[PDB]
Coordinates of C-alpha atoms and ligand atoms in Angstrom, one line a residue:
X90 CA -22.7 0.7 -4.0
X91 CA -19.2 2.2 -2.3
X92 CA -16.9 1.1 0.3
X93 CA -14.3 3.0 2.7
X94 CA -11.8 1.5 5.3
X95 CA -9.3 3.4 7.1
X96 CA -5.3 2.7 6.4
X97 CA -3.0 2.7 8.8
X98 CA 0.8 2.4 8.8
X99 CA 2.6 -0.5 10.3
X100 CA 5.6 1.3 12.2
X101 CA 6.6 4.6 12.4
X102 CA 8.7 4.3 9.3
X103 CA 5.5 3.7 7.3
X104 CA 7.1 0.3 6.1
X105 CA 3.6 -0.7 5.4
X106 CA -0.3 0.0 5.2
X107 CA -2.8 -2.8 6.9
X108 CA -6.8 -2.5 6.7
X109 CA -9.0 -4.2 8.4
X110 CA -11.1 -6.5 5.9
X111 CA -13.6 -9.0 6.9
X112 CA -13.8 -12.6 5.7
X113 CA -16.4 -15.5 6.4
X114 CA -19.9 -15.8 7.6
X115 CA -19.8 -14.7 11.2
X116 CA -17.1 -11.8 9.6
X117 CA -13.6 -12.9 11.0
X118 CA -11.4 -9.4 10.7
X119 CA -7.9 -9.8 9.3
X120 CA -5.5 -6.5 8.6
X121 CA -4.7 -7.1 5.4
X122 CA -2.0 -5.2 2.9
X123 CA -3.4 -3.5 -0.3
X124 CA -1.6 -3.8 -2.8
X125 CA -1.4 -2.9 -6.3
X126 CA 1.4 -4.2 -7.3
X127 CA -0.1 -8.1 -7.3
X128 CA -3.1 -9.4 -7.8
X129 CA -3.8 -12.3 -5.5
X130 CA -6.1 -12.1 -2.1
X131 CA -4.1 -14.5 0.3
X132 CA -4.3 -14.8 4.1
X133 CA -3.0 -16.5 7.2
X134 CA -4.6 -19.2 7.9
X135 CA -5.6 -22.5 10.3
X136 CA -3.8 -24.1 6.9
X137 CA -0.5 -22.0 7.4
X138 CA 3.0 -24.6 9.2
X139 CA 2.2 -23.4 12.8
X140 CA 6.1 -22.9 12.7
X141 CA 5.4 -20.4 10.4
X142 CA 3.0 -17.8 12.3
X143 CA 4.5 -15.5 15.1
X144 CA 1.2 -13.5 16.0
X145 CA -0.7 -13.3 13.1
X146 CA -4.7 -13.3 12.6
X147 CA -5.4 -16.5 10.9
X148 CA -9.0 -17.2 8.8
X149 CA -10.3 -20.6 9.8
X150 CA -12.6 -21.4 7.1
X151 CA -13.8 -24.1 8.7
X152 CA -15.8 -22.0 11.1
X153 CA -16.9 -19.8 8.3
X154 CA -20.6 -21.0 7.2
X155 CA -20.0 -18.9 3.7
X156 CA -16.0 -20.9 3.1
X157 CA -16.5 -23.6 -0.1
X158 CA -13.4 -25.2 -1.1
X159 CA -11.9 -24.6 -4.9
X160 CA -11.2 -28.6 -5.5
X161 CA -8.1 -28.7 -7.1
X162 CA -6.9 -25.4 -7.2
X163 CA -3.8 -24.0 -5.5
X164 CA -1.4 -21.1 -6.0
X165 CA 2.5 -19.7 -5.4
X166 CA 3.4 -16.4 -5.6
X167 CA 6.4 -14.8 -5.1
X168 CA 7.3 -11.2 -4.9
X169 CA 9.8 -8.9 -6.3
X170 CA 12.2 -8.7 -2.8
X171 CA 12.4 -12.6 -2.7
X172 CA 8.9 -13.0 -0.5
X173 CA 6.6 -16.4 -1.3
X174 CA 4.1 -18.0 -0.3
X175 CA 1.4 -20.7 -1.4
X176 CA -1.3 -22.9 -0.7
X177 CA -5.0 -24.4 -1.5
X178 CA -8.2 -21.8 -1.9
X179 CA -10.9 -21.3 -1.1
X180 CA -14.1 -19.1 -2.0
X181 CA -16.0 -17.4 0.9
X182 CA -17.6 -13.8 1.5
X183 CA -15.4 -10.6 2.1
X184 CA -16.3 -7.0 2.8
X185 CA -13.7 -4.5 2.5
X186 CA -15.7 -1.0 4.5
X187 CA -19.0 -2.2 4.0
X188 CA -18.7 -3.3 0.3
X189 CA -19.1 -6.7 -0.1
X190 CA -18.6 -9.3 -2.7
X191 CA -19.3 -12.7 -2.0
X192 CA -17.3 -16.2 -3.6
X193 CA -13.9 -14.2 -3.7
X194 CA -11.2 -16.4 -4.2
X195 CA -9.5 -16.5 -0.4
X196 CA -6.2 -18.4 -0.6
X197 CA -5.5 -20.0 2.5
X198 CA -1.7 -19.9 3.1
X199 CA -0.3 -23.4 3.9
X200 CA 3.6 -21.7 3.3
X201 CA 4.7 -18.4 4.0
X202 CA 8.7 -16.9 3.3
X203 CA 10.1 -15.8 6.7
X204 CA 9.6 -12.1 6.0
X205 CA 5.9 -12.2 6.4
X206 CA 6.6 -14.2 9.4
X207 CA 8.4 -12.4 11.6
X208 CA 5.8 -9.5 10.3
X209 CA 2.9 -9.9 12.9
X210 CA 0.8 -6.6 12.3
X211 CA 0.3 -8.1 9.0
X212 CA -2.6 -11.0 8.2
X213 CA -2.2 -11.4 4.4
X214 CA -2.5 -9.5 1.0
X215 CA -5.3 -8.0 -0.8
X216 CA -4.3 -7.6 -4.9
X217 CA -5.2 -4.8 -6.5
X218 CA -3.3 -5.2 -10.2
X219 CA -4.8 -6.7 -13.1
X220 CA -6.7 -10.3 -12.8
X221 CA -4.5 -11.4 -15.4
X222 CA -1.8 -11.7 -12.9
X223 CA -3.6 -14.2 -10.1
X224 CA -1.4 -16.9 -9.7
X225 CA -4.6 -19.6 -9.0
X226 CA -4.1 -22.6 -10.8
X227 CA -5.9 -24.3 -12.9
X228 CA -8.5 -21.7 -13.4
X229 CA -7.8 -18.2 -12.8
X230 CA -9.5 -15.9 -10.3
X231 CA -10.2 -12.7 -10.1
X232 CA -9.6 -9.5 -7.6
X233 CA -11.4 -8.1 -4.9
X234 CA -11.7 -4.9 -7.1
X235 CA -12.6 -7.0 -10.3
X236 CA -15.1 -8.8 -8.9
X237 CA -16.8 -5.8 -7.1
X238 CA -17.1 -3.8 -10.3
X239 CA -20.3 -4.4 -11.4
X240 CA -21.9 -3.3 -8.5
X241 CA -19.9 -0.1 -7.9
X242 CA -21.2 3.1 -8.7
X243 CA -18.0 3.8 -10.6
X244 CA -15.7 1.3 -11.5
X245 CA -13.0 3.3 -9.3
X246 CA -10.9 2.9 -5.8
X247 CA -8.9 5.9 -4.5
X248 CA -5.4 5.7 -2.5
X249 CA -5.1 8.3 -0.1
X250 CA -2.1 7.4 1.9
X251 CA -1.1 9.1 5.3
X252 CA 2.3 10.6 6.5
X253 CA 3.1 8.9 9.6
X254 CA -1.1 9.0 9.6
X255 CA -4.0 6.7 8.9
X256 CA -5.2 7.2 5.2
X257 CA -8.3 5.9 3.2
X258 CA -9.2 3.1 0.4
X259 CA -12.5 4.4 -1.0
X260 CA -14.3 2.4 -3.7
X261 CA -16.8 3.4 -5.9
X262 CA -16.4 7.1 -5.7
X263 CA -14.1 10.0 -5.5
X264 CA -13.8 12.3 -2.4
X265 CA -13.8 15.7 -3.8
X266 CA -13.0 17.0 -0.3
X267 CA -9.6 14.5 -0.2
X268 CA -7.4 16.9 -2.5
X269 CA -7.1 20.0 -3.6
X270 CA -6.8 21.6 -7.3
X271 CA -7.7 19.4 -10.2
X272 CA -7.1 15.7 -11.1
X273 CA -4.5 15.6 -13.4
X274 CA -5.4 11.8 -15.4
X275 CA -3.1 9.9 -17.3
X276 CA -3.3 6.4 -19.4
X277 CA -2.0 3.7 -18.1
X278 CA -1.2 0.4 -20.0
X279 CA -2.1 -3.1 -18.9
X280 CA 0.3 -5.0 -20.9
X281 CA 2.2 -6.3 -18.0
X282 CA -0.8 -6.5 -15.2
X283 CA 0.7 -3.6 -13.3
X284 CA -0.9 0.0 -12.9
X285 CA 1.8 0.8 -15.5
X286 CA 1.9 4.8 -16.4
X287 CA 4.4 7.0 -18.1
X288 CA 5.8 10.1 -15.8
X289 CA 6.5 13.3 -17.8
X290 CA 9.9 14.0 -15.3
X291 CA 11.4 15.0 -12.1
X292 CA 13.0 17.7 -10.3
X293 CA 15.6 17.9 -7.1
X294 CA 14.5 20.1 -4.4
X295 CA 14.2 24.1 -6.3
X296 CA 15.9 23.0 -9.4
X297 CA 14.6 22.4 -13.4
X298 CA 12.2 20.6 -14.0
X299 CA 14.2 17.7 -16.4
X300 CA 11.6 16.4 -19.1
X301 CA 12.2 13.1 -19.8
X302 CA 9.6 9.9 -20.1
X303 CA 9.7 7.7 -16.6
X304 CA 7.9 4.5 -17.1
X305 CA 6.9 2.8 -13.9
X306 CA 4.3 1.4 -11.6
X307 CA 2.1 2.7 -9.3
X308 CA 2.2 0.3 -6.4
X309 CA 1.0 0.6 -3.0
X310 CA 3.0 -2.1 -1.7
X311 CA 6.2 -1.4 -2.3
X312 CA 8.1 1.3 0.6
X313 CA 10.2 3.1 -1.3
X314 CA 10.7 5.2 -4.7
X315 CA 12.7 2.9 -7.2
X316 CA 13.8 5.6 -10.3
X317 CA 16.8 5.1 -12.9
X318 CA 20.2 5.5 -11.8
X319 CA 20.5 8.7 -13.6
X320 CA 17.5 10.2 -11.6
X321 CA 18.2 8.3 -8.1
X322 CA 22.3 9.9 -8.6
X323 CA 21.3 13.5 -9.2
X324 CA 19.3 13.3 -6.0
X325 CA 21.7 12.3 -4.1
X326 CA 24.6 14.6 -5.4
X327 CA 22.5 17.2 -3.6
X328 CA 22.7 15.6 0.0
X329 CA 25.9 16.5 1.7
X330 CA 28.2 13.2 2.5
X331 CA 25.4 10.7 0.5
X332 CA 26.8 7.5 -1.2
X333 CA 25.8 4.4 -2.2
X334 CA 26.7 1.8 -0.2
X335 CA 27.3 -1.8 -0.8
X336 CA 27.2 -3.6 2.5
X337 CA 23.8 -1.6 3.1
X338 CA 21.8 -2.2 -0.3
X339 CA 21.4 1.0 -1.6
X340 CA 22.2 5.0 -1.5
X341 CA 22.9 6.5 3.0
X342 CA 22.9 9.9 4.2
X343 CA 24.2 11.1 7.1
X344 CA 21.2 11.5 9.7
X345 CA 21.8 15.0 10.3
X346 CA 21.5 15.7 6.7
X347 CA 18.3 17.9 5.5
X348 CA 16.6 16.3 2.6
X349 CA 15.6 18.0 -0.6
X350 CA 12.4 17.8 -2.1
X351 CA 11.8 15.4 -4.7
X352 CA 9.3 16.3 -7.5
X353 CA 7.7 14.1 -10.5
X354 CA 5.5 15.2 -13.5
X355 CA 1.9 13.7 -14.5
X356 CA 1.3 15.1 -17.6
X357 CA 1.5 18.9 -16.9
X358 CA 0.8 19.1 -13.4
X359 CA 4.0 18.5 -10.8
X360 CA 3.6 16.0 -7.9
X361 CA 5.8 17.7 -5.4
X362 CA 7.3 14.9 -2.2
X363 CA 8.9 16.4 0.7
X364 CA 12.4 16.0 1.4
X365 CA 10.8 14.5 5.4
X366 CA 9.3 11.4 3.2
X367 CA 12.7 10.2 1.8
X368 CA 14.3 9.8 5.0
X369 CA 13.7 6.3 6.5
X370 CA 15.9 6.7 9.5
X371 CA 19.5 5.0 10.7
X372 CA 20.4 2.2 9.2
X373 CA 20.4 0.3 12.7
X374 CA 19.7 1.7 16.0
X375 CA 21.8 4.4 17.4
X376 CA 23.5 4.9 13.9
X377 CA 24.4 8.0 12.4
X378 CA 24.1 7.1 8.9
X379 CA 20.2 7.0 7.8
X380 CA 18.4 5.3 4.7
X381 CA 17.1 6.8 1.9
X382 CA 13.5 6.6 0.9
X383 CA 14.4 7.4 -3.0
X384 CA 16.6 4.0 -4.8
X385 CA 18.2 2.5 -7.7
X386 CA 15.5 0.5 -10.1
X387 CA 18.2 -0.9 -11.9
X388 CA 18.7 -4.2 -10.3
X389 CA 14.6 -4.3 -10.6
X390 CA 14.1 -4.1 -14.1
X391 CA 11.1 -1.7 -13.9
X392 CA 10.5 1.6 -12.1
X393 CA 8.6 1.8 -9.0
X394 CA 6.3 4.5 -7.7
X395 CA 5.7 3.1 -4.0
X396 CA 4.5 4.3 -1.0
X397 CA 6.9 7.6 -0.7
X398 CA 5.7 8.8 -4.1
X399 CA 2.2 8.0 -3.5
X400 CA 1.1 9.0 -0.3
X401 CA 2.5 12.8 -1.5
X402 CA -0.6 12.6 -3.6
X403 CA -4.2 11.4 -3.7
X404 CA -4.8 9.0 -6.5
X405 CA -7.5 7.3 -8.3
X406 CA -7.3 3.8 -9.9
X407 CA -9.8 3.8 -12.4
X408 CA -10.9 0.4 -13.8
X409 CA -12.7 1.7 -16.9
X410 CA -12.8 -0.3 -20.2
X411 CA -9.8 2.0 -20.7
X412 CA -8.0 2.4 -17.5
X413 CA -6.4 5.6 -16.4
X414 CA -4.8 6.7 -13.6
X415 CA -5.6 10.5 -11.7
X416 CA -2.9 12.0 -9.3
X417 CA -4.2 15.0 -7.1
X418 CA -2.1 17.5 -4.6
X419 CA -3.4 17.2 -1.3
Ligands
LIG1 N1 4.0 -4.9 -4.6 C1 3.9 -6.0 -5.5 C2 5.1 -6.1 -6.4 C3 6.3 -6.5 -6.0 C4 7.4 -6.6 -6.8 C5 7.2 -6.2 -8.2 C6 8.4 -6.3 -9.2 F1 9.6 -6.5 -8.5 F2 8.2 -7.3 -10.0 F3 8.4 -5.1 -9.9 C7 6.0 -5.8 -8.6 C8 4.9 -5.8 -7.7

């Protein structure tokens, strides 16, 4: 079997991507944020501090004829900006574009960081990383993805990210109409939980190609680029009146600045993002100075490949025995 569900970004920063995604027996219909950068499927729910919900879709399993509770089991998660939540879960049916698995762990959110609060367009998270990150205690659960396997014709899902545009999860199969040229594939290594992958280099705007080896993640839940300094400084020593800044968090650019292009390697093919895709817009409103899409990874501790690198390309997550990762032009 396959599945397909339309993405669409949250703002028109593209901040984030929510798809619908439907939970419980009659289907309840939450937005939910794929991401494959964690690994946990955990919603809003009638569970979550009522203090603690400003708009959200909550899932009530108690009108859910499919919900069973997981006696004893809860989870806490927290992410890599300082996000957390946690709670009890639950097992109940879910159906992500027509493909459905049913018992999928669904952890109820009884606590929730003020960040997904004060974040309405958002109803929870759908993890798309390695099992062996779920945070369930005692007894481990598995993905959405993970769980669906077995039934898919190939043990694949596709990220085909929009600019300022809806996009597509697709599961189970690869749309050869989605890109253009050939899937370039490269291995990826599980040791951590994360898509990790190893980037054969970068380029600014029309310059050489620098070969060097970028280790990072490919995440579709994190916003922005996160590179080395090295890489993130000789970008910015090409935009006219750029500097890192302090009070801001990271490298500015005067608004009226036209970006470069920003290019990274995948074996021997080039993944070419347009200079448009860095720039995340002034800093506050009416403000000349604008944010840059492409940052530091060094107060991270690992590289990111987000949503600016990503939606420049179509890619395939492919859950073989030996996982590998494909990035297509598009
Ligand atoms: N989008 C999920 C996510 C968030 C943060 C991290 C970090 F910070 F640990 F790298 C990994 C994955």
């Amino acid at each position: 079997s396959t599945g397909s569900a339309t993405t669409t970004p949250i703002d028109s920063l593209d901040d984030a991507y929510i798809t619908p995604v439907q939970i419980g027996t009659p289907a309840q219909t939450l937005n939910l944020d794929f991401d494959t950068g964690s690994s946990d499927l955990w919603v809003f729910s009638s569970e979550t501090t009522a203090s603690e919900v400003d708009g959200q879709t909550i899932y009530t399993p108690s009108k859910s004829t499919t919900a069973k509770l997981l006696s004893g089991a809860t989870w806490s998660i927290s992410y890599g900006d300082g996000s957390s939540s946690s709670g009890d879960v639950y097992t109940d049916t879910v159906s992500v574009g027509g493909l459905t698995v049913t018992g999928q762990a669904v952890e109820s959110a009884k606590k929730v960081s003020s960040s997904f609060t004060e974040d309405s367009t958002i109803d929870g998270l759908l993890g798309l990383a390695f099992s062996t990150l779920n945070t369930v205690s005692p007894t481990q659960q598995k993905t959405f993805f993970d769980n669906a396997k077995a039934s898919l014709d190939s043990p694949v899902f596709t990220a085909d990210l929009g600019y300022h545009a809806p996009g597509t999860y697709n599961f189970g199969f690869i749309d050869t109409t989605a890109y253009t040229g050939s899937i370039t594939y490269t291995a990826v290594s599980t040791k951590q939980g994360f898509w990790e992958w190893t980037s054969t280099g970068y380029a600014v705007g029309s310059g050489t190609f620098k070969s060097t080896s970028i280790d990072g993640i490919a995440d579709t839940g994190t916003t922005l680029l996160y590179l080395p300094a090295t890489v993130v400084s000789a970008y910015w020593a090409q935009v006219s009146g750029a500097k890192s800044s302090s009070s801001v968090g990271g490298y500015v650019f005067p608004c009226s600045a036209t970006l470069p292009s920003f290019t990274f390697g995948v074996g021997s093919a080039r993944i070419v993002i347009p200079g448009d895709y860095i720039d995340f817009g002034p800093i506050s409103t009416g403000s000349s100075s604008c944010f840059g899409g492409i940052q530091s990874s060094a107060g991270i501790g690992i590289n990111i490949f987000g949503d600016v690198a990503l939606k420049a390309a179509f890619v395939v997550f492919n859950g073989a025995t030996t996982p590998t990762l494909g990035f297509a032009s598009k």
